[PDB]
Design a protein around this ligand. Structure first.
Ligand SMILES: [K+]
Ligand SMILES: [Mg+2]
Ligand SMILES: [Mg+2]
Ligand SMILES: [Zn+2]
Ligand SMILES: [Zn+2]
Ligand SMILES: [Zn+2]
Lengths: 234, 48, 125, 51, 48, 44, 96, 51, 48
RNA sequence: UCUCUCUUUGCCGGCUUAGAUCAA
RNA sequence: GAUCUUCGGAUCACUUUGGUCAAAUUGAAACGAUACAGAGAAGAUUAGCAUGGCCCCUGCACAAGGAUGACACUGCGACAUUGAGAGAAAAC
């Protein structure tokens, strides 16, 4: 009898006793673009009142919370759920098609069959974590000296490098690696070039950090990747 | 002409429907020639 | 003031409805991608455009961006002053997006669109 | 649970946008009597000339 | 009505328009053509 | 909304006693009445 | 962009005269030349919603399903067609 | 609901060192009153004991 | 002003006068009905 | 049983005072 | 705090916060101008009324207007093939 909106108890307050109001037809569904009733309550004294933002047809076809839109089974954003878990196909993003899908899905879904069962949801969660753990575990000579000497003069089967003392992996990994070798200024990097250049407040920290040497390095777009292919022949 | 009251403009404009009623109630109680001023009981929207 | 005057940290997860900056997130994602992103997609990278003084654009933006939050990927076009810095958390990402607009490096900070690289799409997924 | 009262002066809250009509229920079987034969002669007798 | 049309839209679809002494002929012609279409659809036998 | 949609004729009229309600039509004998009326017309 | 342009032109052409089955047949053919499934079926069954008694459309749909070796799909389509029009022998003959 | 809200606040602030009675209500109010500054006297109106 | 008709000036005596020469498009867009004009004139009388 | 050609081959915008007038 | 009551106490009152959303570049619309063509019915000038809908605008309007408001008004294969000949091929 237009009784309740579905809200999880994380954003329903830690009090088992709360009061809320409804304003019928108070907003257009942010997905259905449909006239829907609003519900306002207080999570806890001292913060701004919450309110429901999506209709009852949604957050049910999505099995989600009308206010926080965290999925009611796992508790992480429904967008990330449908992007990574990929349980069942979602709707479009354009206006007319999205509202058409919302209307027809609400119709065929109130006919009685449920579009969301949690058994397959947990199965897909375990499948995703399994795939994650699975993820966890003369032509070369001519493209070698073709341009290295050119740049070296301009601004400076097997190949073995030299070690000099002249005075997938994000950048924060570099940040928490060099912090014990001296203060950091900026870490400029590029995955394609695979070259990460750091700067310190003093050259003494740089030289003491570089002395730790015996995967590591010591001192256009495609134009910077010529020496990155040396990784294939390192 | 201020955004401080930008939330009330829709209600402010919807009272345009009942404005002629306000005109009738105002003209019905116009002071007569023999009285210098007349105090009228009034009912107003909290929006103004 | 009634709001935090500090920098968001690693464990500062907010509601999906409320923008991590305190605002609210709609669904249509607009056409200029101007003020606040949509909740139907989560992009950790932002388009920053502006000056292209010399080859040191990468380092200057790095200097001007590390202080705003944890950085994941910096990709700055050499031909034009266009960069696509990718952040680690939504809070730092949107804080820097809102906090660096019309600054000196005015900067045209906007929300990035879908990356057409099938490899970048694969790694992002 | 309390129904919040609406402002009497409040105009219509939002626009209404038309939606193309949804698909109907799927058509029933036809159940016709078996078709009769007409033959080419009667096919010709119902042929109309151009105007 | 003015404020409803202002804040809602035309709602042009799904409205009827009475015959008003200028559409009389153009509506009579439409009705006659529809009737003739029905008669054609009927008197022509099956599969012709 | 529209001028012609305003309330009007809010009282539905029912057939009264001598106006030919269902009770009388069931009680009446329509057949011989019809033949008598036809004969009266024929006489003219 | 080319499929978008052709799609928009065909979509208006079928919205203007929704009873023109030739437009739906041509739209299904042109859509079938690259993206062989899913929305092809959508467009075709939309046309059947417009008029399910058009036997040429049913036959065209069957043939278009069989070109791409979808057999069980076509058998389901025949069951629908034969339970819809049991007194036309063309569908029965093609089925058998 | 009043009691549950009070209990939640007490649990959050860990400050539950009070009792309940009839005279105890006035006794609790006494110290909150003495912390308060006095209410001025009307017709004293611009500083120096304004109401 | 919720019609974009910002070039029309409603003076304090309730006269609708354009502030600039209007093209055909503006003139057709800025045409009000009998309700608005009737209410404006009643308001003018009340102000008198 | 192929290839080409010919032939056979049933076949798949409306209304009104014609809307009204008309010399280099 | 007022009232009684007998210095035990009793009365009297009892949980706000209308939120197109935090001090206006980057989440209330819709465009100016310049540059191109640039005014329905088979010659030419031209009355109009209609049909269709994810096209609207003015209007209080189920009047009427906006160029007859604008756009649109076409076209194909549930064709069965045999009727025959010729060189080849495999076949009367
Ligand atoms: K004309
Ligand atoms: Mg008209
Ligand atoms: Mg028209
Ligand atoms: Zn929730
Ligand atoms: Zn919805
Ligand atoms: Zn502050």
């Amino acid at each position: 009898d237009v009784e309740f909106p579905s809200i999880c108890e994380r954003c329903l307050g830690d009090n088992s006793y709360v009061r809320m109001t409804k304003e019928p037809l108070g907003q257009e569904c942010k997905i259905c673009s449909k006239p829907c009733t609003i519900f306002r309550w207080i999570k806890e004294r001292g913060q701004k009142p919450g309110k429901t933002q999506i209709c009852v047809g949604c957050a049910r076809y999505k099995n989600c919370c009308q206010s926080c839109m965290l999925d009611l089974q796992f508790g992480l954003p429904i967008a990330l759920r449908d992007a990574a878990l990929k349980l069942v196909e979602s709707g479009p993003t354009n206006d007319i098609n999205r509202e058409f899908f919302a209307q027809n899905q609400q119709r065929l879904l109130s006919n009685g069959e449920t579009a969301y069962d949690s058994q397959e949801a947990s199965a897909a969660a375990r499948n995703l974590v399994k795939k994650v753990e699975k993820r966890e575990l003369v032509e070369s000579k001519q493209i070698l000296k073709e341009a290295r000497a050119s740049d070296a003069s301009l601004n400076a089967g097997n190949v073995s490098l030299s070690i000099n003392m002249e005075p997938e992996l994000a950048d924060y990994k570099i940040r928490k690696h060099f912090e014990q070798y001296g203060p950091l200024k900026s870490v400029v990097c590029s995955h394609r070039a695979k070259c990460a250049f750091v700067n310190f407040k003093t050259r003494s920290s740089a030289e003491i950090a570089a002395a730790a040497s015996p995967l590591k390095v010591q001192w256009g777009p495609e134009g910077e990747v010529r020496n990155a292919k040396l990784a294939d022949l390192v | 002409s201020s955004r401080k009251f930008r939330a009330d403009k829709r209600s402010y404009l919807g009272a345009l429907k009942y404005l002629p009623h306000a005109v009738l109630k105002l003209l019905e109680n116009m002071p007569m020639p023999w009285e210098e001023y007349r105090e009228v009981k009034v009912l107003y929207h909290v929006t103004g | 003031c009634e709001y935090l005057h500090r920098l968001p940290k690693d464990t500062d997860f907010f509601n999906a409805n409320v923008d991590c900056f305190g605002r609210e997130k709609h669904a249509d994602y607009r056409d200029d991608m101007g003020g606040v992103g949509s909740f139907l997609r989560q992009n950790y990278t932002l388009y920053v455009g502006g000056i292209t003084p010399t080859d040191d654009i990468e380092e200057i933006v790095s200097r001007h961006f590390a202080e705003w939050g944890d950085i994941e990927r910096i990709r700055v076009l050499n031909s034009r002053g266009i960069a696509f810095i990718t952040y680690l958390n939504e809070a730092n990402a949107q804080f820097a997006k809102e906090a660096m607009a019309h600054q000196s490096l005015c900067l045209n900070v906007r929300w990035a669109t879908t990356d057409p690289n099938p490899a970048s799409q694969a790694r992002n997924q | 649970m309390v129904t919040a009262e609406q402002d009497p002066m409040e105009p219509p809250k939002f626009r209404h946008k038309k939606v193309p009509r949804g698909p109907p229920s799927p058509p029933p079987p036809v159940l016709h009597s078996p078709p009769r034969k007409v033959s080419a002669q009667e096919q010709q007798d119902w042929q109309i000339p151009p105007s | 009505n003015l404020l409803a049309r202002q804040f809602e839209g035309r709602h042009s679809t799904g409205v009827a328009k009475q015959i008003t002494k200028q559409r009389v002929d153009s509506h009579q012609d439409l009705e006659l053509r529809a009737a003739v279409m029905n008669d054609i659809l009927d008197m022509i036998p099956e599969g012709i | 909304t529209s001028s012609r949609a305003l309330p009007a004729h809010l009282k539905l009229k029912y057939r009264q006693e001598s106006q030919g309600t269902e009770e009388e039509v069931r009680k009446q004998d329509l057949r011989e009445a019809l033949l008598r009326a036809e004969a009266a017309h024929f006489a003219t | 962009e080319f499929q978008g342009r052709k799609r928009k032109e065909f979509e208006d052409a079928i919205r203007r005269n929704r009873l023109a089955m030739g437009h739906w047949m041509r739209y299904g053919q042109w859509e079938l030349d690259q993206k062989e499934f899913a929305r092809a079926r959508s467009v075709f069954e939309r046309a059947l919603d417009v008029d399910s008694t058009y036997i040429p459309l049913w036959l065209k749909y069957i043939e278009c399903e069989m070109k791409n070796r979808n057999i069980n799909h076509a058998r389901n389509l025949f069951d629908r067609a034969v339970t819809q029009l049991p007194r036309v022998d063309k569908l029965w003959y093609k089925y058998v | 609901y009043y009691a549950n809200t009070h209990a939640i606040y007490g649990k959050r602030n860990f400050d539950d060192n009070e009792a309940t009675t009839s005279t105890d209500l006035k006794r609790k109010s006494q110290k909150i009153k003495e912390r308060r500054e006095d209410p001025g006297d009307p017709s004293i109106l611009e500083g120096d004991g304004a109401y | 002003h919720r019609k974009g008709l910002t070039y029309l000036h409603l003076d304090y005596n309730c006269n609708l006068k354009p502030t600039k020469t209007l093209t055909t498009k503006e003139r057709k867009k800025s045409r009000f009905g009998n309700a608005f004009h009737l209410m404006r004139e009643i308001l003018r009388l009340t102000k008198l």
